[PDB]
Amino acid sequence: LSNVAGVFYILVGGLGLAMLVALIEFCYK
Amino acid sequence: AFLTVERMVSPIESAEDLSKQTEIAYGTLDSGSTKEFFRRSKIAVFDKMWTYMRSAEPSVFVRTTAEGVARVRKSKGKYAYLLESTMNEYIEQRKPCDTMKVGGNLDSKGYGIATPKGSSLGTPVNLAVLKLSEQGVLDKLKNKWWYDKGECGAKDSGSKEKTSALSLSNVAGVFYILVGGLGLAMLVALIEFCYKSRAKTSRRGRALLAVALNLLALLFATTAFLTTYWCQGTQRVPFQLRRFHTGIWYSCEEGEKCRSFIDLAPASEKGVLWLSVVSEVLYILLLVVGFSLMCLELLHSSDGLKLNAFAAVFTVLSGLLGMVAHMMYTQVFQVTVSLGPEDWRPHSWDYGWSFCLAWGSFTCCMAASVTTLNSYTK
Amino acid sequence: KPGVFSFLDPLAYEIWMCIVFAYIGVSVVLFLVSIFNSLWFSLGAFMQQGCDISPRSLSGRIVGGVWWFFTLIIISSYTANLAAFLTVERMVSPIESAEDLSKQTEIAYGTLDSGSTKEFFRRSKIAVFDKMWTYMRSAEPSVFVRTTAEGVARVRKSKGKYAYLLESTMNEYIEQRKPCDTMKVGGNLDSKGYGIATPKGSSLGTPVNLAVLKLSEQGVLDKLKNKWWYDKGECGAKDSGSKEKTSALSLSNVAGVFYILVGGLGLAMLVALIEFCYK
Amino acid sequence: IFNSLWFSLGAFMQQGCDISPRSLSGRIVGGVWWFFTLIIISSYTANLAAFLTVERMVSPIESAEDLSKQTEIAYGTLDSGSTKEFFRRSKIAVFDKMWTYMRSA
Amino acid sequence: ILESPYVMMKKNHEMLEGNERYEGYCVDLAAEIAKHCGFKYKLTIVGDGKYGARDADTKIWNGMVGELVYGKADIAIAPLTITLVREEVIDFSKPFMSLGISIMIKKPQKS
Ligand SMILES: C[C@H]1CC[C@]2(OC1)O[C@H]1[C@H](O)[C@@H]3[C@H]4CC[C@@H]5C[C@H](O[C@H]6O[C@@H](CO)[C@H](O[C@H]7O[C@@H](CO)[C@H](O)[C@@H](O[C@H]8OC[C@H](O)[C@@H](O)[C@@H]8O)[C@@H]7O[C@H]7O[C@@H](CO)[C@H](O)[C@@H](O[C@H]8O[C@@H](CO)[C@H](O)[C@@H](O)[C@@H]8O)[C@@H]7O)[C@@H](O)[C@@H]6O)[C@@H](O)C[C@@]5(C)[C@@H]4CC[C@@]3(C)[C@@H]1[C@@H]2C
Ligand SMILES: O=c1[nH]c2cc(C(F)(F)F)c(N3CCOCC3)cc2n(CP(=O)(O)O)c1=O
Ligand SMILES: O=c1[nH]c2cc(C(F)(F)F)c(N3CCOCC3)cc2n(CP(=O)(O)O)c1=O
Ligand SMILES: O=c1[nH]c2cc(C(F)(F)F)c(N3CCOCC3)cc2n(CP(=O)(O)O)c1=O
């Protein structure tokens, strides 16, 4: 499961990086 | 990797394999010429087998022949046994027939008719052996007393298919979720034929349920915050029996006793555990932030959905850090088993009972979310 | 030589039928959304090629999802079983016992044209050995060879579809001799023994008979059997058993899918021309 | 002829195409070649899996007992010298089998 | 010696008498030697249950060999392994059944 676990941090880290994008584009509108 | 190694493994045939492998044990009777044969033999294969069997702990030497029959049957193939081939024919014929004879003979021995020395009968009896062996009447009686007396087949030994392909039964556990998904869907179609047919309590009563599911999501969060016992930790030595009932943090052992044993080795795994506590607390704190903004909706039930849109952010960010936290502990709990948990390893290794519960806390965080964005449509 | 039926190895023949049986059971459900159309929309959910009818969020979304989930399992499992056949490659022998020779008729079998072995089948009363002798007396062309080395070459030249019956200790030794393209299968058909003979009434006869029971007891005979069959054997068995490290794909394996490729085309050309007359 | 050349690339391996010959003979033509191409590629995967595994399954030999075990890689000494004399003289069964091979080489 | 399938007891051995009470592979062989050599026969089970080993202390053969050497028995039709030290006191015939040590393992399971 540690083999998959290295893809979890790019899974969750891609989500939290996207939440920065959605909130600023609410201010770019 | 499964089907190859499954087909890479050959069944052993010769006894040179037993000098080559060590996983399947093998023995003889505890007294007899067969045990004496390996004790006497100078061939290096037979000598190595005797070197193994004199060093075999626990003892491969059985006391009766039927004990050697059952010890093969009970060990499930990882114990072999060495016996006389004609008897090995007959016991393979006797039910349950779960044993079998493999390979050729290790040596040559012969049963022969004996007379007292100097008897007059000795010479025509010796001629009678060369008469009956010539005519195959002995082999006819061998067909009689091993195969007309044999319970499992006479030719049915050759009915076991050798190296055939993947079974249909391998694909049968997915049939019940195939057909079961169909019959569950037929319930959905017939009731939605009546939901098209029977037709502020819509957006409010579903939003209050989203608050109500978060309340259960809080309680199962506190439930696995102290697990009653995470695993039935079994070290049942036939020493004596051991039953650890270790929670999520306190490692209780059980007559009744309980200890902490929190924060084991190693240090890199400790920083994972220090990070594990962070994802536990951020799970519960962002619930409380989600409770407070929904209590503003209760003041709005006495902005609005704009703060409920902000409340739906942190409740998802709660449960995802719980999905971190559920993977922080069990990977570590898998890591601690890889350490050999110092004296408290489980052999009934099985997650218990609040970890299935705090699973449902996450889906209550998300079932609250799917209906509070349903009220966001208005 | 592979071919048509041999492409179908990694998935069993019962599984070939049941994958098509449960296939048509799914397509009747999507007909209630919009039996006649969804038979091809079940081919839209067969492996790939995402179909155009989308039962958006009702029960057909579940029916359209599970069979789609079901089929992505198999093609992984078919690939994994295929990699098992393409890597392990245990060439199994067709036959073991002589009862198979009473059961099959494709691989011929014979003895020497004169000897006790031919006499044995001529004399035997066991129905398996009698049927083999019934075959060999009716074997045209004659399976009976004139020399033993003729029986060696006739097995070698017929390429496995001719067997031969000979003495097991000699069958050990010839299998050791190169080209080593023959092998011994199965156990003995009977019990025969080589034994030291003396003239009758000789004084040497008794301690020589005791000498046999001494050397067989000590395994020096078996040590010389290891000497004169395996220290003299040219093809060392496990040294020759571990020799295959070969490579890339055949073409007869793919060729079995060509006949269902072209045969599906010519069957479709019948359908198009008659539907030009159904219009 | 003009459009379906790329819609044959829509049925090449993946990328389900937009023209759907719904339930006529083109559904059969669109299905069989699509069925034909998934064969080639699954077998291409299993062949390459048979390559890289056996390539990594092969260990380089380190002991001379491997030379008594294998026969594909030959091995010899100088035609005269104590080293050739050593295998000629040795009583260890591994070294004796190597000399048995080299005198039969 | 009572060994399956060489010498066995009947289910109705009380309903039978003498040689009829016994059955097995060596029992049918005992009929064939009588058909060959022309004699009446008495199948007797060995008392101690031994195959006829030699003592190392008294150097007295027990078992069937002790019944054969000491005049107690007339002949043996039994699974008796032909060894060197057994021929030193009695006379075997030619072997009717070659055998050797074999490997009994479990059969591959159908699970
Ligand atoms: C509680 C127990 C514990 C142990 C114990 O203490 C208490 O110690 C034991 C000890 O061990 C005792 C044994 C010692 C050894 C004894 C041996 C004896 O037999 C001996 O003598 C013959 C029988 O008396 C045997 O052979 C006879 O039977 C056939 C065996 O196959 C022969 O073939 C036949 O010879 C021929 O006879 C004539 C015809 O041609 C045919 O019928 C036959 O082919 C023989 O029958 C007799 O044959 C006559 C001609 O040979 C003689 O009468 C004599 O043969 C020779 O006998 C010689 C003996 O000295 C003698 O010198 C010589 O002149 C004789 O010609 C023999 O009787 C022969 O094989 C053997 O040697 C046996 O019956 C009894 C015996 C086992 C004893 C029984 C009791 C014990 C076990 C004692 C007892 C358990
Ligand atoms: O002459 C001999 N004949 C034997 C014949 C048989 C049987 F198979 F029943 F016929 C057996 N059995 C097989 C396993 O042990 C229990 C019974 C043992 C025999 N032994 C003992 P050994 O000293 O272990 O060889 C002999 O000596
Ligand atoms: O006593 C006998 N001993 C025998 C020994 C052997 C050998 F194996 F070579 F030792 C052979 N061969 C079998 C292999 O091919 C060459 C000859 C025949 C023998 N025969 C003839 P049979 O009448 O056919 O049995 C005997 O009679
Ligand atoms: O005392 C000895 N010292 C040796 C030293 C060497 C060198 F390596 F060059 F130092 C060599 N070589 C290696 C191969 O052969 C050509 C030169 C041979 C030697 N030999 C001959 P051997 O009989 O084959 O052992 C001796 O006898």
- Structural biology method used: cryo-EM
Tokens of B151: 């319970």
Do residues E93 and E76 touch, judged by C-beta distance below 8 A?
no
Q: If you measure from the C-alpha of residue E71 to the centroid of ligand 1, how many angstroms do you get, rounded to a whole number?
A: 7
Helix (H, G, I), strand (E, B) or coil at B113: strand
Task: List residues in chain B that are followed by a break over 2.5 Å (C to N).
Answer: 199, 238, 254, 302
Task: Check CB contact under 8 Å for B331 and A12.
Answer: no
Do residues C208 and C196 touch, judged by C-beta distance below 8 A?
yes
* Residue among E62, E88, E92 nearest E78 (CA): E92
DSSP string covering E29-45: HHHHHHHHH--------
Task: Check CB contact under 8 Å for B109 and E100.
Answer: yes
Do residues C176 and C183 touch, judged by C-beta distance below 8 A?
no
Q: B248-253 long-range CB contacts below 8 Å, 24 or more apart?
A: B248/B224, B248/B329, B248/B354, B248/B355, B250/B226, B251/B344, B253/B344
> How many angstroms separate the CA atoms of E65 and E47, rounded?
12
Helix (H, G, I), strand (E, B) or coil at B101: strand
Kindly tell me the burial class for residue B155, based on how many C-beta atoms sit within 10 Å of its own C-beta (0-12, 13-18, 19 or more).
exposed
CA C133 from centroid of its chain's CA atoms: 26
State if residue C149 touches ligand 3 by the CB under 6 angstroms criterion. no
Place of tokens 């020395």: B117
Say which amino acid occupies B130.
L
> How many angstroms separate the CA atoms of B354 and B356, rounded?
5
Kindly tell me the burial class for residue B84, based on how many C-beta atoms sit within 10 Å of its own C-beta (0-12, 13-18, 19 or more).
buried
Question: How large is the C-alpha radius of gyration of chain B?
Answer: 35
Q: In this complex, which of C26, C74, C97 lies closest to B158 when CB atoms are compared?
A: C97
> How many angstroms separate the CA atoms of A10 and C182, rounded?
59
Kindly tell me the burial class for residue B26, based on how many C-beta atoms sit within 10 Å of its own C-beta (0-12, 13-18, 19 or more).
buried
Burial B321-335 (b: 16+ CB within 10 A, else e): bbbbbbbbbebbbeb
Question: C59-85 and C13-27 helices cross at what angle (nearest 10)?
Answer: 160
- Residues near C204 by Cβ (< 8 Å), separated by ≥ 6? C198
> How many angstroms separate the CA atoms of C170 and C183, rounded?
11
Do residues E52 and E37 touch, judged by C-beta distance below 8 A?
no
- Residues near B194 by Cβ (< 8 Å), separated by ≥ 6? none
Region of B94 (left: φ > 0; alpha: ψ -120 to 50; beta: rest) is: beta
* For testing contact with chain C, the best of E83, E84, E98 (most C CBs within 10 A): E84
> How many angstroms separate the CA atoms of E79 and A6, rounded?
68
* Residue among C22, E67, D2, E20 nearest B180 (CA): C22
> How many angstroms separate the CA atoms of B233 and B350, rounded?
9
DSSP string covering D6-51: HHHHHTTSSS--S----SSHHHHHHHHHHHHHHHHHHHHHHHHHHH
Q: If you measure from the C-alpha of residue E103 to the centroid of ligand 3, how many angstroms do you get, rounded to a whole number?
A: 30
Number of CB atoms found within 10 A of residue B304's CB: 11
Number of CB atoms found within 10 A of residue D28's CB: 20
Question: How large is the C-alpha radius of gyration of chain C?
Answer: 31
Residue B186 pairs in a beta bridge with none
Helix (H, G, I), strand (E, B) or coil at B102: strand
* Residue among C29, C23, C22, C36 nearest C55 (CA): C29
Do residues E28 and E7 touch, judged by C-beta distance below 8 A?
no
> How many angstroms separate the CA atoms of B49 and B19, rounded?
6
* Residue among C166, B149, C106, B315 nearest E24 (CA): B149
How many angstroms separate the Cα of B314 from the Cα of each of B299, B324, B327? 20, 15, 20
Beta-strand pair C108-110/C162-164 = parallel
* Residue among E80, E105, E91 nearest E29 (CA): E80
Helix-, strand-, coil-residue percentages of chain A, each rounded to 5: 95, 0, 5
Region of B247 (left: φ > 0; alpha: ψ -120 to 50; beta: rest) is: beta
Do residues B69 and E78 touch, judged by C-beta distance below 8 A?
no
Say which amino acid occupies B235.
Q
- Residues near C109 by Cβ (< 8 Å), separated by ≥ 6? C98, C101, C132, C135, C136, C143, C162, C163, C164, C165
Chain A CB within 8 Å of residue B292 CB: no
Of the ligands numbered here, which is closest to the C-alpha atom of D83?
4
Do residues E41 and E29 touch, judged by C-beta distance below 8 A?
no
State if residue E49 touches ligand 2 by the CB under 6 angstroms criterion. no
Where are any strands of DSSP class E within B52-129? 79-84, 99-102, 109-116
> How many angstroms separate the CA atoms of B181 and B184, rounded?
5
Place of tokens 């079994």: B234
Atom of ligand 1 at shortest range from CA of B122: 31
Q: For D90, phi and psi rounded to 5 degrees?
A: -65, 145
Task: Check CB contact under 8 Å for A8 and B327.
Answer: yes
Do residues C37 and B192 touch, judged by C-beta distance below 8 A?
no
Chain C CB within 8 Å of residue B8 CB: yes
> How many angstroms separate the CA atoms of B154 and A7, rounded?
58
Q: Which positions in chain A touch B317 (Cβ < 8 Å)?
A: 19
> How many angstroms separate the CA atoms of C217 and C211, rounded?
10
Place of tokens 């394999």: B17
Tokens of B332: 């570590």
Q: Which positions in chain C touch B41 (Cβ < 8 Å)?
A: 219
Place of tokens 């799917």: B370
Helix (H, G, I), strand (E, B) or coil at B196: coil
Residue B252 pairs in a beta bridge with B245, B258
State if residue C168 touches ligand 3 by the CB under 6 angstroms criterion. no
* Residue among D27, B189, D21 nearest C28 (CA): B189
DSSP string covering B271-320: HHHHHHHHHHHHHHHHHHHHHHHHHHHHHH----HHHHHHHHHHHHHHHH
Say which amino acid occupies B148.
D
Task: Check CB contact under 8 Å for B121 and E75.
Answer: yes
> How many angstroms separate the CA atoms of B341 and B349, rounded?
12
Residue B111 pairs in a beta bridge with E81, E97
Question: How large is the C-alpha radius of gyration of chain D?
Answer: 29
DSSP string covering B36-55: HHHHH--SHHHHHHHHHHHS
> How many angstroms separate the CA atoms of C209 and C170, rounded?
24
Place of tokens 């052993």: B12
State if residue C148 touches ligand 3 by the CB under 6 angstroms criterion. yes
Q: For B63, phi and psi rounded to 5 degrees?
A: -95, -35
Smallest CA–CA distance, residue B193 to chain C, in Å, is 11
Tokens of E105: 């393992």
Chain B CB within 8 Å of residue C15 CB: yes
DSSP string covering E73-104: -S-B-S--B--HHHHTTEEEEEEEEEE-EEEE
Where are any strands of DSSP class E within chain B? 25-27, 79-84, 99-102, 109-116, 231-234, 243-246, 251-253
Longest dimension (CA), chain B: 122
- Residues near C213 by Cβ (< 8 Å), separated by ≥ 6? E82, E83, E84, E87
Kindly tell me the burial class for residue E88, based on how many C-beta atoms sit within 10 Å of its own C-beta (0-12, 13-18, 19 or more).
exposed
Q: For B46, phi and psi rounded to 5 degrees?
A: -70, -30
Tokens of D60: 């380089």
Chains E and D touch, contact meaning at least 3 pairs of CB atoms under 8 angstroms apart: no
Q: Which letter does DSSP use for residue B171 in this model?
A: G
Burial B111-122 (b: 16+ CB within 10 A, else e): bbbbbbeeeebb
Resolution, rounded to a tenth of an Å?
Answer: 4.4
Q: Kind and range of the H or E element at E8? A: strand E8-9
> How many angstroms separate the CA atoms of C64 and D45, rounded?
28
Chain E CB within 8 Å of residue B106 CB: yes
Smallest CA–CA distance, residue B331 to chain A, in Å, is 7
In the β-sheet with B231-234, what is the strand arrangement from edge to edge? B231-234, B243-246, B251-253
Helix (H, G, I), strand (E, B) or coil at B16: helix
3-state SS string for chain C: CCCCCCCCCCCCHHHHHHHHHHHHHHHCCHHHCCCCCHHHHHHHCCCCCCCCCCCCCCHHHHHHHHHHHHHHHHHHHHHHHHHHHCCCCCCCCCCCCCHHHHHCCCCEEECECCCHHHHHHHHCCCHHHHHHHHHHHCCCCCCCECCHHHHHHHHHHHCCCEEECCCHHHHHHHHHCCCCCCCCCCCCCCCCCCCCCCCCCCCCHHHHHHHHHHHHHHCHHHHHHHHHHHHCCCCCHHHHHCCCCCCCCCCHHHHHHHHHHHHHHHHHHHHHHHHHHHC
Q: Which letter does DSSP use for residue D79 in this model?
A: S
> How many angstroms separate the CA atoms of C145 and C113, rounded?
5
* Residue among B88, B78, B32, B74 nearest B56 (CA): B78
